[PDB]
């Protein structure tokens, strides 16, 4: 088995004279289980937050981009994804959030994701997920990880940076990119713009729901026909039905809603399509293979370009074994 390099990469080692990061040098290092200097890591995080802070809650860009599902600090799975989806140097990617928690390599994902965003902030977009919070990071093994690998300094930095991440994005002003889904307190795009991103997600509300939003247990064979309902499964938020989403779309003249937050055995799942257009009203993307290291589910990413929706599927990747709570 390979051994992790004790030599930590320095700023001048990651960033060239032009101030541009060497994703090539970092990628190779990370692949060997290498870590960077506390100073460098803080620079990348802080540098990424500044850029995101300039972004709006709901970004609107008309261009071919590939949507990715939950990562769960699955760096080992993030490397393979880029291989199948293509190099980010000339390929536009879009994350739906959830880059930390679950995986014992959340730091590697955030660091690599942040560095890639600063290098190609016009081709790489990152959204905030229900996991992008402090309360959650404290409960999960994220906080402990940052303290075990680095310190509370890096953890706090990420938290403040995550608050700068976008909530949603309008791809081609037709598709809506989100983590959870629609919200009852949000029937228009303006409702989202009037939202506060620079802050922590509450246990409830519009911003929280969108991140915790989820389809009804029967987004198909429904008997009641309820639009919105309490999310008893997730233990919070609400649930949207086929008729509920179809109503919001028509009102907002949207094509489809691309998001994740829901694990899929095939890395993706298509929901009931519109009665008018032969397109799915909702779509779930999952880029986290072998969820919980138990399920043998596959991963995939949505690629929209030239009016073409290409779905790329991939299997899990090799990684070391880690005990629970780093026990």
């Amino acid at each position: 088995v390979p051994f992790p390099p004790s030599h930590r990469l320095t700023a001048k080692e990651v960033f060239d004279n032009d101030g541009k990061p060497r994703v090539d040098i970092l990628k190779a290092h990370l692949m060997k289980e290498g870590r960077l200097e506390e100073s460098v890591a803080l620079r990348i995080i802080t540098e990424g937050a500044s850029i995101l802070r300039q972004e709006k809650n709901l970004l609107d860009i008309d261009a071919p981009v590939t949507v990715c599902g939950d990562i769960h600090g699955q760096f080992f799975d993030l490397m393979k994804l880029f291989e199948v989806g293509g190099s980010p140097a000339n390929t536009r990617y879009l994350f739906l959030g959830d880059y930390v928690d679950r995986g014992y390599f959340s730091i590697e994902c955030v660091l690599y994701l942040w560095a890639l965003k600063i290098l190609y902030p016009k081709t790489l977009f990152l959204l905030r997920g229900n996991h992008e919070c402090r309360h959650l990071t404290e409960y999960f093994t994220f906080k402990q990880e940052c303290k075990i690998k680095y310190s509370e300094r890096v953890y706090d930095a990420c938290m403040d940076a995550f608050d700068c991440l976008p909530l949603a994005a309008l791809m081609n002003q037709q598709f809506l990119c989100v983590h959870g889904g629609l919200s009852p307190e949000i029937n228009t795009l303006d409702d989202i713009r009037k939202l506060d991103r620079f802050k922590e997600p509450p246990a409830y509300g519009p911003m929280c729901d969108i991140l915790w939003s989820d389809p009804l247990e029967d987004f198909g064979n429904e008997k009641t026909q309820e639009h919105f309902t309490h999310n008893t499964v997730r233990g919070c938020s609400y649930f949207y039905s086929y008729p509920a989403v179809c109503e919001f779309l028509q009102h907002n003249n949207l094509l489809s809603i691309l998001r994740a937050h829901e694990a899929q055995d095939a890395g993706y799942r298509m929901y009931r399509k519109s009665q008018t257009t032969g397109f799915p009203s909702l779509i779930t993307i999952f880029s986290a293979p072998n969820y919980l290291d138990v399920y043998n589910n596959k991963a995939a990413v949505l690629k929209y370009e030239n009016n073409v929706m290409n779905i790329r599927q991939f299997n899990c990747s090799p990684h070391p074994y880690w005990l629970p709570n780093f026990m």
Binding site: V84, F279, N307, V308, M309, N310, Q313
Partner: peptide, 16 residues
């Protein structure tokens, strides 16, 4: 079927 264009690639290792 999907009105617009749509494609799909193959997996990395069929399971079932």
């Amino acid at each position: 079927g999907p009105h617009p264009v749509i494609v799909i690639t193959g997996p990395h290792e069929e399971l079932e």
